Amino acid sequence: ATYLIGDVHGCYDELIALLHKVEFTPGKDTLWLTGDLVARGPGSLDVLRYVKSLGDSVRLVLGNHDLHLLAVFAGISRNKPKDRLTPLLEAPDADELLNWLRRQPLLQIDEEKKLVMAHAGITPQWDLQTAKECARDVEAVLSSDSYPFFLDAMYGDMPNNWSPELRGLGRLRFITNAFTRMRFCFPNGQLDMYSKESPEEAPAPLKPWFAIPGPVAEEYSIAFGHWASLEGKGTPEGIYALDTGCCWGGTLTCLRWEDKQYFVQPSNR
Numbered sequence: 001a002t003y004l005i006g007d008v009h010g011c012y013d014e015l016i017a018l019l020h021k022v023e024f025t026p027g028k029d030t031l032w033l034t035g036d037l038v039a040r041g042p043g044s045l046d047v048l049r050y051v052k053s054l055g056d057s058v059r060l061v062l063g064n065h066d067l068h069l070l071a072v073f074a075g076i077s078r079n080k081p082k083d084r085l086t087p088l089l090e091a092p093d094a095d096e097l098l099n100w101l102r103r104q105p106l107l108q109i110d111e112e113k114k115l116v117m118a119h120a121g122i123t124p125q126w127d128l129q130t131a132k133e134c135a136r137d138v139e140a141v142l143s144s145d146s147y148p149f150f151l152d153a154m155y156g157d158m159p160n161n162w163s164p165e166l167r168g169l170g171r172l173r174f175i176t177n178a179f180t181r182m183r184f185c186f187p188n189g190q191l192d193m194y195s196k197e198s199p200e201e202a203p204a205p206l207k208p209w210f211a212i213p214g215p216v217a218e219e220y221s222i223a224f225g226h227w228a229s230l231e232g233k234g235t236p237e238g239i240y241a242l243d244t245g246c247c248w249g250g251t252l253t254c255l256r257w258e259d260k261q262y263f264v265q266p267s268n269r
């Protein structure tokens, strides 16, 4: 079976309880995770250990908090006490865990399921070939010995409009923001980097990225996490918002792909 789970955010107990609920069995089953494995919840260390141990039985995409953890680890960014990352950062296997984490994809595609996953979704300004090329470019910098330079360069809110003519720092920053920070778009598809509210609470003319028809969404289902204030609701057919806010006191959500059946684990917080 194929299971897809939204942002775990260190909620190790809830993740294991949910997987036991569906009798997740590596070798028979595959787990897709929308990223943001770490921060806020108490068990980022156990989450990373477990997910890495799954190997080919898990298909991960990196989220914005995963990238922030890598930035903290590399000395690029300051650790925030609220993220509860110190046990992971101080673990004897921190190097092993985080060097694995930075090699994971930003984008997962299953052609037989016609299924695409990224942390925040797929901007309507991207077709599939462009999404693939951009994911490959940023994954290459993240997997390289020089990844702290990219992590430092990734921070920024501009440019917010895609063009194949983009080059250099702006190209990487847009790619990173589209895959891991996107929520709202202007009517032309341009990213808004400030509003984090629910669609009903957002100011005009902002619309959810998935409310703007784009070539990937027209052919593929898209699963994503990230947007907790969406609460997994209000999406069109073929769009699966899996982040139901477990670390925030909401729930951890698991979708079984074969029958589109949902399983929910309440937050222990």
Ligand SMILES: [Mn+2]
Pocket (backbone or CB within 6 Å): 007, 009, 036, 063, 065, 226, 227, 243
């Ligand atoms: Mn998140």
Ligand SMILES: [Mn+2]
Pocket (backbone or CB within 6 Å): 036, 063, 064, 065, 119, 180, 225, 226, 227
């Ligand atoms: Mn996120």
